[PDB]
Ligand binder design. Sequence first.
Ligand SMILES: NC(=O)c1ccc[n+]([C@@H]2O[C@H](COP(=O)([O-])OP(=O)(O)OC[C@H]3O[C@@H](n4cnc5c(N)ncnc54)[C@H](OP(=O)(O)O)[C@@H]3O)[C@@H](O)[C@H]2O)c1
Ligand SMILES: NC(=O)c1ccc[n+]([C@@H]2O[C@H](COP(=O)([O-])OP(=O)(O)OC[C@H]3O[C@@H](n4cnc5c(N)ncnc54)[C@H](OP(=O)(O)O)[C@@H]3O)[C@@H](O)[C@H]2O)c1
Ligand SMILES: NC(=O)c1ccc[n+]([C@@H]2O[C@H](COP(=O)([O-])OP(=O)(O)OC[C@H]3O[C@@H](n4cnc5c(N)ncnc54)[C@H](OP(=O)(O)O)[C@@H]3O)[C@@H](O)[C@H]2O)c1
Ligand SMILES: NC(=O)c1ccc[n+]([C@@H]2O[C@H](COP(=O)([O-])OP(=O)(O)OC[C@H]3O[C@@H](n4cnc5c(N)ncnc54)[C@H](OP(=O)(O)O)[C@@H]3O)[C@@H](O)[C@H]2O)c1
Ligand code: NA
Ligand code: NA
Ligand code: NA
Ligand code: NA
Lengths: 259, 259, 257, 258
Amino acid sequence: SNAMKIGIIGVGKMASAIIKGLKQTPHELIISGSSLERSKEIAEQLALPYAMSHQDLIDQVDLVILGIKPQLFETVLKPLHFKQPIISMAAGISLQRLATFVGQDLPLLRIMPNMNAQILQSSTALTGNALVSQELQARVRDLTDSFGSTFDISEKDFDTFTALAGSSPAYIYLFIEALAKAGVKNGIPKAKALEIVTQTVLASASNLKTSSQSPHDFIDAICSPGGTTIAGLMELERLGLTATVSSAIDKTIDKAKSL
Amino acid sequence: SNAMKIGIIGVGKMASAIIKGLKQTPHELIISGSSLERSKEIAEQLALPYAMSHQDLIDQVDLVILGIKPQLFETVLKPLHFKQPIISMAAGISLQRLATFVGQDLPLLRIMPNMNAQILQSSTALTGNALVSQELQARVRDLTDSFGSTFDISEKDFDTFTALAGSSPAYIYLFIEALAKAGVKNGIPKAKALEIVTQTVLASASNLKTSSQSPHDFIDAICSPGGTTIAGLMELERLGLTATVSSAIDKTIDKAKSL
Amino acid sequence: AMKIGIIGVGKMASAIIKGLKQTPHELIISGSSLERSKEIAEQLALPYAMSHQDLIDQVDLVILGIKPQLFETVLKPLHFKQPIISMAAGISLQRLATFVGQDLPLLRIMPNMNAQILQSSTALTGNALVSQELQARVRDLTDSFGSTFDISEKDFDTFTALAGSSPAYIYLFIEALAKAGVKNGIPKAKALEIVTQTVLASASNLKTSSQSPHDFIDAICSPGGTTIAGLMELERLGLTATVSSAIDKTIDKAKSL
Amino acid sequence: NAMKIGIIGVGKMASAIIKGLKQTPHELIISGSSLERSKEIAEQLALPYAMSHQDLIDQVDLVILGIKPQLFETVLKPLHFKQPIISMAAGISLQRLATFVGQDLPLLRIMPNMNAQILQSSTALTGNALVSQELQARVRDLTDSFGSTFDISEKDFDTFTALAGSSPAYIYLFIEALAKAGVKNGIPKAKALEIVTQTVLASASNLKTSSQSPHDFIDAICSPGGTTIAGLMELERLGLTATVSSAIDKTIDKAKSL
Ligand SMILES: NC(=O)c1ccc[n+]([C@@H]2O[C@H](COP(=O)([O-])OP(=O)(O)OC[C@H]3O[C@@H](n4cnc5c(N)ncnc54)[C@H](OP(=O)(O)O)[C@@H]3O)[C@@H](O)[C@H]2O)c1
Ligand SMILES: NC(=O)c1ccc[n+]([C@@H]2O[C@H](COP(=O)([O-])OP(=O)(O)OC[C@H]3O[C@@H](n4cnc5c(N)ncnc54)[C@H](OP(=O)(O)O)[C@@H]3O)[C@@H](O)[C@H]2O)c1
Ligand SMILES: NC(=O)c1ccc[n+]([C@@H]2O[C@H](COP(=O)([O-])OP(=O)(O)OC[C@H]3O[C@@H](n4cnc5c(N)ncnc54)[C@H](OP(=O)(O)O)[C@@H]3O)[C@@H](O)[C@H]2O)c1
Ligand SMILES: NC(=O)c1ccc[n+]([C@@H]2O[C@H](COP(=O)([O-])OP(=O)(O)OC[C@H]3O[C@@H](n4cnc5c(N)ncnc54)[C@H](OP(=O)(O)O)[C@@H]3O)[C@@H](O)[C@H]2O)c1
Ligand code: NA
Ligand code: NA
Ligand code: NA
Ligand code: NA
């Protein structure tokens, strides 16, 4: 059948998020944690089969997905013997470096998902090494489409995409929290302030998405002469909002590079 | 019939946006611009009846909507004789001040919409003076629901809501532009960078909306220990993203207060 | 064809006379002292008056070229009897009526130094005594040394910053580009030639195009390129905030004058 | 005395010089990042396309490169060049270009800007040791067709890139800042922008035709106890000059690292 068996090594927050989307596929799933005790425990919570070891996982599966953090790739992967294509979700680790940990004869793929996988709206980058066929990439693209959208991104752009899509949800939340806290400062209860700004963020992003106008086109439209919005906007300029965000993205990329 | 005749005095960007939603109602619409030449010209563009003067507008209508900027309220309104309930969309002008321009015997309402009215997803505050009945408020709430959602907000909170919902779209766009420009700095074409971040902003806001978790709960989930996201987040802290946004909201509110 | 008189002729007033010489009107000037009047009249190839009042009695229209802080001192002891045009920053039509009279049509202009090449961007406005006749005759005057903007008086201080003061900010900006050129190995004259020509062309491109400045910025910023690196440095150090705060200060000063 | 000129990579900048190239006697042909893209671009620009880069190279007297600097190595090494080549790329020296395309070719660099769209680019031009008097003169006619041309030595190219290639973006951010200051203070954006754009245009024209320096002009415009001097000292306070200089330095750093 089109159905394959997929094993996941390391199941934390990001891997847990993509499981939900993977349950909506025909495929069979099996997991493997940091200890056997931990594996049973999360297999409990997710209602899925667990493996007795990572090698035990590897020996029965058609495709492996790696959910461990990048700092543990060498330690965890080198002692193992892989036998199928592997997908890494890890920031900062190239396909070339993965091949040294895992083997030069394996088709290897990289994805860069985000926590919006939780609602099947991840914005996920996908790329493969020279051993990945058209058909295999398409099969994996089916997997990524199950928990959001999929972007065909060159590997040389993966670190930048990690910042724009992978990490940015946190920056978006801090920004949202900032508007809401400012509502609190100024008289509006937190829950109410959050509801208003979250709905406004949603609507503003849809409006941009479906319009041919740029972000600056909208800003010109919204800033009435001598109005309240231009006052707030020049305060954003004075305090360096744009420089702040961009510097943050630079730091994110720098970290991805050093990993 | 339930249908009324509604006249709009001053039709710029914000008033143009709410027309689309008002066309989806049973009601009859008529507009009135800055000059008769301008009125014909925009009635042309919107495919609607225009009035020969503001008084000409006032004499045939069941409800007036004011789309002029706050700085022109005194100049434009005092010479006129109003005969029906009026809705003001203007930032910074209380119902009490409007009554001095327009009359102490009129039911008066305030709304605070945003440019997302363009896609019928405005987040709109609504309030009325002591002359507004339950039935009239409900009829006007029907109007506001035609171009988005409606919030029952005390007038004392209108200036803060103006900042959180009315002006914030511009701040959201500048923030989005900042992420996208940072993608450009780092190798990703503008259009592509915008597509990725706009979709991520959309998805992140839906995820927050439908979840019981706070923005900081999500941030903890997204920040892997020693990872790329915590690096970028501490850079946002170092450069004062939260203080920046909040100071901007303060400036927005200050301007609303001085108007 | 009227006889037009100018009281006070410094930098701005001198720049404006080149354009006025190309109108059919007759001109006469009056300075800070008889000697100064003659010195100035010689170099402009124009007649001069023996005193401000002597100027006033023979002239259809007065143009004021003195600094705002001299308006009271210089105008109060005179007796005007024509429409007056003020080019002064900070001085309202209302305040001027206080110095010269409540029965006079009074206009304000706000030109800039580009009058020298007849390309000033000049705001024009008048009080309640100004017919659509008079505003027309005066608009012909201002079109002689550039373009004319019908600007309401409430917007004059801002126009003053945007068109009147801004040439100096533009020049500091150009100078900064050229100094940056010098710092990095290109001679001052050559860098200034390059930059001036680039500013000139850029603004011509913007003017004839339907695209916004930010649209052009998007076209110019190649992904991973040099321009986006420089642009984000400008954002880091606050170019936009800095210009805006300078404009606010210009407007604050206009207000307090 | 007419060449055929071929163009490899056609983005914003390359599309901008076409208009001037069309006013020349020379024949033109293009080649993009795929055959599908070549035809879309040919459609938009009303110009012949080649079936591939080598196909372009094989039938052409001169090659102009409009690809990004980051792509030179990947795109140029596999090909076999057979004629003089003009690069418009930031940051890549003639010496480095020769390692990608061969040591036996006359090679030239230009540095234009987006004002080529209206035939008013400020374009630097330089050639390697293999470029003749006559060839550079022929290239000078090419760049003269979309603006002015500056004979500048290559050691000065990264600085020229910043002053003339990148600077229009800095000029527009400045104009935009002036226009937004207008909006903040009650004047509509379109109106504000019309006023400042016209002022920048006239100011730069006055400077060009005067013998006075920018600082001379500043002295003229700053009436004692006036509004301009107050704004000027605010620019000084907040560091306008050092800000522009620092951006130029960063533009040049980037060109160096490319
Ligand atoms: N979080 C995000 O929003 C995000 C977004 C995009 C990409 N990513 C990528 O996703 C990957 C995981 O990130 P995360 O945030 O999910 O990290 P996390 O929450 O810390 O999850 C890592 C998991 O791996 C487990 N683990 C530790 N040692 C192991 C080993 N010996 N063998 C098997 N499993 C082991 C840990 O188990 P215990 O709990 O028992 O210690 C933990 O649950 C990273 O590579 C990151 O680059 C994350
Ligand atoms: N823009 C927003 O995102 C936003 C958001 C929330 C609330 N608001 C509120 O909405 C109101 C309008 O803002 P806006 O951004 O739409 O401003 P705008 O774009 O400048 O529109 C104002 C319009 O009123 C017209 N007008 C001027 N004088 C008039 C008079 N004599 N009689 C009738 N009409 C006249 C102008 O006509 P001409 O074009 O011919 O000059 C202009 O089209 C403001 O009160 C503001 O507080 C705006
Ligand atoms: N400069 C600009 O770029 C600019 C731009 C737009 C608007 N403006 C406005 O234009 C006006 C002129 O400014 P400016 O920069 O041209 O100043 P300026 O060069 O210093 O001119 C002032 C002139 O007034 C003369 N004056 C002094 N006392 C006088 C008196 N008692 N009677 C008659 N004339 C007297 C001075 O004569 P002496 O030379 O003998 O001292 C001097 O020539 C100001 O009101 C300013 O706000 C200036
Ligand atoms: N932008 C400026 O104002 C400016 C000013 C002076 C000099 N420059 C220089 O001009 C060059 C291009 O800049 P730009 O702003 O025009 O960048 P751009 O718009 O991104 O153009 C680069 C073009 O190269 C194409 N391309 C990608 N891969 C290719 C390949 N495999 N073979 C052939 N063509 C390929 C791209 O096609 P697709 O669209 O199909 O991907 C794109 O259209 C740069 O080297 C830069 O240093 C730029
Ligand atoms: Na790395
Ligand atoms: Na107020
Ligand atoms: Na004043
Ligand atoms: Na370089």
